[PDB]
Amino acid sequence: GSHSMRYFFTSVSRPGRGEPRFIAVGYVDDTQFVRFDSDAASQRMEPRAPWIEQEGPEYWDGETRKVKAHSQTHRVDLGTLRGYYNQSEAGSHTVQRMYGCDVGSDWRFLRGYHQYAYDGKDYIALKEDLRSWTAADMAAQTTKHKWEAAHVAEQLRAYLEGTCVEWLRRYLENGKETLQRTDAPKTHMTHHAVSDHEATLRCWALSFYPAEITLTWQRDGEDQTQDTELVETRPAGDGTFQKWAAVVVPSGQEQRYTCHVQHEGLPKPLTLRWE
């Protein structure tokens, strides 16, 4: 299957209360593997998955150096953007940056990403060609010009097409037992009367990896999208995911309904019926 590596960075100002808090997290696919938290005691990049603990001190020292530099850049950004938007010094603001790369089933580069948000809205993003920038408004155009002059896109392209892909492969190899696995969903259905003339049928998918899944209900083969309660796919806390989909069935009509499950770990999609 395809794979991805992503790093996510959040900095939040707290005027009067010291430096902004900075949190970095790194993922391969849907598995977190590192963190940094400016408020924590270690002041180091830390492992958050067992497979990465085998990395040595060279690795951890280097990642710590880099993430500290990221922390400083983003602290400065909070001040610069406060100025660019003519905002008061009293309020808390947020900056977010995400970057990373995708590869296909052949582990070859598919695409690269680098984007930046201020107070939860797009600020500046590298376009798919990794050569040009989208800027959200007039403030952002200024940053675009600074980053054009400093040839940032060329640097990021080299990272995204090169380093990121090489390391994603390295991590996939080194963490093979966790990262190269598929856990097919374990499925079941529940049935609960809501009255004497209706019942809820809930179709469950549990303990699956990766998180990507499709769960749908049909009635006599017709999709029931508008009448299905579908929850967001949610972490179990153990590296697997969960999801369910429910429909309210008039009593006596259970046989009309089918639940359809599609997941990488299922060679053929499943069709479930209450019967």
């Binding site: 590596m5 530099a69 990021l156 390391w167």
Partner: peptide
């Protein structure tokens, strides 16, 4: 796999 280049102030 921390980018070491391309991460500049706004």
């Amino acid at each position: 796999x921390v980018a070491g280049i391309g991460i500049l102030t706004x």
